[PDB]
Ligand binder design. Structure first.
Ligand code: MN
Ligand code: MN
Ligand code: MN
Ligand code: MN
Ligand code: MN
Lengths: 344, 344, 344, 344, 344
């Protein structure tokens, strides 16, 4: 049935503690929740968690375009969801809102069909497992946090690096010693030069440490640099900030620049994310899925995407786990590091 | 709900006249119909129209593997269709059967969800239009046939060439004269050398004739030859036989070999065809969709695929129109050269 | 001296008639004017003319981030303009505002230094000349409009094409006949396939018509397509939508994709535009400068940029001339199609 | 205001001790000071420190063209500095004089505007820090000099190598032991083969020594050799002699040959140096700035360039620190290894 | 025997009329004559005809370095000429002087050996033939000048173009009409864009005119542009300004940029010129030899080089023929457009 209203609302979520990554420290997520209302009375929901650093977005700006978004899709039947996806692909300057609107569309459609979004998308998996992230801090505090995560039962530990190469090498080496059995993802958030990035990898390799995925060591535009790291260090290299659109991923594949792509709905929307999954499966690329600052309602989007496509070797879906005092609003089951589909 | 049976049956369909293409002439279509039965009682249908020349398939061979196909997917819920797609991707030696089983799966699922396959696939378009094909014959007979097609309301005329460069040039020029306003697709079915293919295009261009799509002038393995034709003649060049899998298309894109890909479900199945649509839309590829010897139930698969994805500039879905007075078994409206979505 | 305030204000300007280009028609320009106030009392001005189609921007979104922009640069001395440029490079999601803030900074600094922005930028030229644009309409109306422009003294005529290849060829041929001596720029605003773009160029060449610059015939992401047109047609090919950032231009240069780049301050800001001038002058790129929907105060930014750097073979700075009777608010002399530096 | 005179004068500066690099030993700098006099009475100053080895120049030859230089720019207003830059770009056979004249122009212009050259150039930084260089000598003497430099408070030590691979490896390893905490730049001044250069780097890497920048290990024309070193050894590789012009740098970027460029005003002039900064910032290249045999008045040129653009990770501006008995004639503050902008 | 003195002297030669080429017009040749005196009493002679536009040289600068040149080679036996060549290769900033000194060396050695320079170089040919050049002027005057040249017995006519595409096309077409049977070399001296250069060639080709060699249509640094012209127009393309050194030529060969190189001793010296001959003969390069403003003593250098190596399809050795009534000072026979070896 046809969309009759679209509502955007500011929702704020406080962190338990400041989240520090290369070039950014944040203590709060300010997101935009999207509600799509159909003539049937069905309501679908999405969440835009904007990124100034990655997408150039500001939450004030997303909220400002409510009327435009409404006018762009009101009157369209959610069964013609490809029309909605094409229209919302015009929101390339507001990719988090693109994502939220596209997901809300599928959330509404799946209800009208008596199913769930993961099933519309293929129903490949019934369960996925997330890592949890260690932010930047003193070496001692990074080690402490990594151990905590390991004690919580997380089997993959994501470690932020990028601001201090020497301390980064030390932190990862100390973490490895006290979390024997864990797999490690290292995310440099564009902090290193090509040569610094190679040296980080070599240093930890020399201690017999294996890094499962080494994310975006160099700047967004430095595709040749990503390739250099890939070809001169022993760990799989992922594009994150360099992989926002489906066109970005075609370029990465053509240049043989990466082993992995980290898909985020907040970069790509559902439309480009689906294209990227297909490109990757046609090209020997492996995939992980990540997040920005989504609450449980926002993480829901990626949970259904990951369950449905089953495309991901790794899942970095932990933003909702970093919140101070939250009421759970996902349409999935959180069970420790695992997420599962609802019977209903 | 879960698959409880899978049935394969031989179905034969007679042509109105022998269909002559480069290196092949046939008077009959021998297809394998697939029925999937669910525990709910819902039945989904697909059709495999095999190709010995393109896929290396034989109809007897498809029939012989009924028990294997049944064992592979019985017990799986169609809501987990990605699992069925991944399993049936193992049928790469029987791609027409891969397509039929994958479509039958979606036919059944759409019924359980109270919708149509085109809608599962995005519901992008409500209407498409097909060309109709002029087979190889004497120049006089080719012209007669083209005039017949034009008087049946077709606005796009597909002209088979490839066995006689001089007569092919003459036939196309004479056809152009008696079908003013039509658009032309020329399909050489691998018959020309790269230089012959260039000279065919040049000869027709010099007469002021525009060819909308120039399909597969050279052999399947001759990607560099396809590229040569692309870069040295004025009309858009399509891969057909060179584009069977999603991997083939990634290679064509990397090599900049073609302007178009002709997707056929009988080459790719649903899984690879969806991948190819995504790759093309991420790479400035244009698309057409074609067929083998599908009857109306078989063409239904492509009609829903094309309506739902809306991915195609041109449609060459005319096999059922070349067959001799069948009872109509599609789930779409055939409106002269137009196909329209049902109500349902 | 130091910035003490930054003010953003909505300013609307009516067109003389609807401006139709490939995929877009507008009757009004809604811009954001930027005022920077220094502790000295000096005020500098810029204008953001946003583009949804090219930059993904919306005017409401620009307005919404006034406080953020103010916080980002308040307290900084305009003599340290490189610091302001680096900070405002973070506004990559709001490139038109990036441009306006960067220019306002130089407008204020030049006043404190007792000079003009063109002189800060090198003072290369005292005079430039702009084309004027023929929008899409019926062939008869396009010809009427071109004749009007020719009788207004313009020596370079920019002709929009892209929606109808046959009518575009006819319009350009008819325009050429009634504007003998004019030079022509043809802007396809991404409307053609690579092969259609080649055939447009060939058709006009065969009539003995020379096109000075053939702008962006293909889509933004289709760099290989741009190169194809460049290598297979006789006129200089320009990137417009494909050249937004300095990084885009390095890629175009590496791929040998174009003969020209059309710099627009609304895509690049001052910072990337200066980089692009330097890259082009180091690579055998030629340059033109264009606009969006700037009023006279907005066009001033480009006039000073073009006068100072002297980098452009062609100038397409006509947006203010398409606007309905404004009070002139430039800091340059408008002398028919010519712009000249002030005394001051 | 307009240039009314240009004067060239020979100035000789004796070194405290002979400076030995690969293929060259010198005990004195013979420079050409440039004075530009304006009609306002303002006087701007530059210095050409010619290089026979790098630029093919001889000081006698620079002095010989005084009248030509005068005639080329007399009567031009320094506010049109781009015109002066374009004219003096014709002095590509006398690049040190090109640099001196271009800087003298900005020195005069900045006085007329009531500011400083660093501010005309962006005012990005208020302070920079230089390394100091260890020349070639016996291993013992090289170690002694490196220790002295470290004791002087220099945090980056530049070590000349290139004439004796075995002794070079020994010297760098011994230096590292006695200067723990220092960063190292190694400059081979074209002395090594590709394979020798890789082996030098590997040998020192094996002792746990990090080289911040490894400059020009191979000959000027051996771009492929520079790339080979870059791709097969662990340290960032810089072009110096291979990077004289902006066109050279475009080639280096296209070939992915280097991690760094060492800009010297004496190679590039201000015009090409500014282009190189822009190219580098558009291409993932990092930068250092170096010198020839400039006195304090000559080093002033690079100090303002480096302060203003803030483009450099490393500064090798130490030629004026190697002089016997000199009267300071810079327009900056020297404060140990640091240089700072004047309040005035 | 050993060099005991080296003398440089200014020699001026007046043209018959101003010689206009793209971006340069001159009425006089100011050359530096080199005399090398041996202990045996034998004297060898060379001539440097410098080029500011191509080499960046000034005659005053060449004169200024007499003492340096003398110190560099005095005391060396001319039988060890490779030592003198390697030393004078250091004069890369004064390439015309490099050439003059290297030739004077061979002039002296050949005398001591009782032979001629052409014989030292292989004695391949006894006779060569030169073109003569039509400078830029009005179309009427260019045609007049070409007719004059044709009536002086020249069979190859070199036509300068580059400043006015339309008039250049007209001039060449009119010249072709009045010089039936002549071969044509067209030298654009870097005046055209790649596309303008293509269109010049196409326009003349369409008139049935063949251009034997089309020299340097684009700028020195624009190697990719040279290649573009080569691949997109029907006449052989030559590098002139882009081929100064042996390293330049290796790059041109690797890039497949040209059909021809124009060797000039004033760009390359004897050493690089011999290298270029060997490279060309190993790569399917064809060669022509040109000049700057050499008098008869200067042209002698090129005549012996061309006679001895026999490497050139075309000779453009006409500078002495454009000079106003000189006493003949060559060591060859000038026989109309032909040059022949002496007896001795
Ligand atoms: Mn990441
Ligand atoms: Mn076909
Ligand atoms: Mn445009
Ligand atoms: Mn160096
Ligand atoms: Mn020439």
């Amino acid at each position: 049935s046809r969309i009759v209203n679209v509502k955007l609302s500011l929702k704020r979520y406080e962190y338990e503690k400041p989240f520090h990554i290369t070039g950014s420290v944040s203590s709060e997520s300010r997101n935009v929740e999207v509600e799509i209302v159909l003539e049937s009375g069905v309501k679908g929901y999405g969440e835009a968690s904007p990124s100034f650093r990655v997408n150039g977005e500001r939450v004030e700006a997303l909220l400002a375009i409510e009327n435009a978004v409404r006018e762009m899709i009101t009157g369209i039947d959610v069964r013609n969801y490809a029309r909605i996806f094409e229209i919302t692909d015009r929101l390339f300057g507001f990719p988090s809102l693109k994502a939220a609107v596209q997901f809300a569309t599928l959330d509404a459609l799946s209800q009208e069909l008596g199913t769930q979004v993961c099933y519309l998308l293929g129903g490949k998996r019934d369960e996925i497992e997330t890592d949890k992230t260690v932010g930047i801090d003193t070496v001692e505090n990074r080690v402490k946090e990594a151990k905590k995560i390991f004690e919580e039962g997380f089997r993959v530990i994501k470690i932020k690096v990028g601001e201090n190469l020497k301390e980064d090498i030390e932190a990862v080496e100390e973490i490895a010693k006290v979390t024997r059995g864990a797999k490690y993802i290292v995310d440099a958030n564009m902090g290193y030069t090509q040569k610094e990035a190679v040296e980080f990898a070599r240093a930890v390799y020399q201690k017999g440490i294996d890094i499962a995925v080494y994310e975006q060591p160099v700047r967004r535009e430095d595709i040749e640099g990503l390739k250099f790291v890939r070809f001169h260090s022993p760990f799989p290299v992922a594009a994150d900030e360099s992989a926002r659109t489906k066109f970005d991923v075609m370029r990465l594949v053509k240049e043989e620049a990466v082993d992995y792509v980290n898909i985020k709905l907040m970069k790509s929307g559902i439309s480009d994310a689906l294209a990227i999954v297909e490109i990757a499966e046609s090209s020997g690329l492996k995939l992980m899925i990540g997040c920005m600052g989504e609450s449980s309602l926002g993480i829901n989007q990626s949970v259904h995407f990951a369950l449905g496509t089953g495309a991901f070797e790794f899942h970095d879906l932990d933003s909702h786990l970093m919140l101070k005092e939250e009421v759970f609003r996902g349409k999935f089951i959180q069970d420790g590091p695992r997420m599962r589909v609802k019977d209903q």
